[PDB]
């Protein structure tokens, strides 16, 4: 038995979100629904067809009609971006089922510009023979995001690792960017700066070794 | 209140045998069906198999013939055993208590609450704890009423690391970034949190690592950097 359901919806902020789910005769079963934010364990949203548990707003709520079950989320906030799963159990194989889930994502929030922060190789880590400039972005929306790196106003693409943007609690979007460095490349340079491009416009900051 | 919490060993070498716990808390196992589910990194819950103090079980097709699922009263705790592994069975592996209903002639259940995940890497490769270093504050980390300060936890293997500040009393205020897969084949991760400058001078910030696939924890002292 199988369970379907769209792979994403978009919605804009305060708008109605609708998540729809259908398997066999469902409507014959009971339906269950579960939320998943990035990085979390699920958790029960609604159950039987329309119950809302204990602790979870009335904004969200569940529908049923012939072949198809509904997540409905009104009034739909950025901190409800998740993924959904539907859920039956098929009582003559004595088996749970899910659905494939859907990824729900609010677009048309505020743009936000990144903060970026530079630290330096702190001394115990040069003292391990080792260097690592590490650059956090923060605070931005949309998502996409580009870092590059200079030593001396020339770049630098060896030894350079890039995380994919990711959501903060605020709901605003952040990342990271390593440089690894010998010991005696960083000090070699007079300085090392991380620039970022978000949404065409850019953020840098500098670094120096004979600055503490 | 009703908990959850599963146990694993982190890394298992293909071929060789899976085996979990899940540890209950504010209830007793006789009262409730146990299941256990798992989640492959970027895809779909998967069911796995329930199980009954008195000894019904039920599993998945898929790993019926490799699964073993049995509990343990007398410490209020129910296990998972998958023999065999291949990369396939890499994933998030989660217990939940299963709620019932009894309507006639079908069969309604469903998952309240979720145990908070372990992830079961396979792999070859052999497990490496974390080195931890401190990312001070300084005079260049303000933005005025505020400093950044964080925690770098390089070269690890498998995935993850969790991290806390201040023994779990310091939340607000904290990012932990995911981690970077370098090319050695080791994970790096950040975690900063933002804090006042005014309070540098006389507050105590300390990062709590895990990375329980190695048993390790780390609490590393993140002190103003002084030239």
């Known amino acids: 038995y199988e369970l379907t359901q769209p792979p994403s919806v978009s919605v804009a902020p305060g708008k109605t979100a609708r998540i729809t789910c259908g398997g066999n005769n469902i409507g014959s079963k009971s339906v269950h629904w579960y939320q998943q934010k990035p990085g979390q364990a699920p958790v029960l949203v609604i159950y039987y067809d329309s119950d809302r548990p204990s602790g979870i707003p009335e904004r969200f709520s569940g529908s049923k009609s012939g072949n198809t079950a509904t997540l409905t989320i009104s009034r739909v906030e950025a901190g409800d971006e998740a993924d959904y799963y539907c859920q039956v159990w098929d009582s003559s194989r004595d088996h749970c089922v899910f659905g494939i889930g859907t990824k729900v994502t609010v677009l048309g929030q505020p743009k936000a510009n990144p903060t970026v922060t530079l630290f330096p190789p702190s001394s115990e880590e040069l003292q391990a023979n080792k260097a690592t400039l590490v650059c956090l972005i923060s605070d931005f929306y949309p998502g996409a995001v580009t870092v590059a790196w200079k030593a001396d106003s020339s770049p630098v693409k060896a030894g350079v690792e890039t995380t994919t943007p990711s959501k903060q609690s605020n709901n605003k979007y952040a990342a990271s960017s390593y440089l690894s460095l010998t010991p005696e490349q960083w000090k070699s340079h007079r300085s090392y700066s991380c620039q970022v491009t978000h949404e065409g416009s850019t953020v840098e900051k500098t670094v120096a070794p004979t600055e503490c | 209140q009703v908990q959850l919490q599963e146990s694993g060993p982190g890394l298992v070498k293909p071929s060789e045998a899976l085996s979990l716990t899940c540890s209950v808390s504010?209830?007793?196992?006789?009262?409730?069906?146990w299941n256990w589910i798992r989640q492959p990194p970027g895809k779909g819950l998967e069911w796995i198999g329930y199980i009954f103090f008195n000894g019904n079980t039920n599993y998945s097709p898929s790993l019926k013939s490799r699964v073993t699922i049995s509990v343990d009263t007398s410490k209020n705790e129910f296990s998972l055993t998958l023999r065999s592994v291949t990369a396939a069975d890499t994933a998030v592996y989660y217990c939940?208590?299963?709620?019932?209903?009894?309507?006639?002639?079908?069969?309604?259940?469903?998952?309240?609450?979720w145990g908070q995940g372990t992830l079961v890497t396979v792999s070859s490769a052999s497990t490496k704890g974390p080195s931890v270093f401190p990312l001070a504050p300084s005079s260049k980390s303000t933005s005025g009423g505020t400093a950044a300060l964080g925690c770098l936890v390089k070269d690890y293997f498998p995935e993850p690391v969790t991290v806390s500040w201040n023994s779990g009393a310091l939340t607000s205020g904290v990012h932990t970034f995911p981690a970077v897969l370098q090319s050695s084949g080791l994970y790096s991760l950040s975690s900063v949190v933002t804090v006042p400058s005014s309070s540098l001078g006389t507050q105590t910030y300390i990062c709590n690592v895990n990375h329980k696939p190695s048993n390790t924890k780390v609490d590393k002292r993140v002190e103003p950097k002084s030239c």
């Open positions: 504010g209830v007793a196992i006789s009262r409730h069906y």
């Open positions: 939940a208590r299963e709620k019932s209903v009894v309507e006639p002639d079908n069969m309604v259940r469903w998952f309240d609450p």
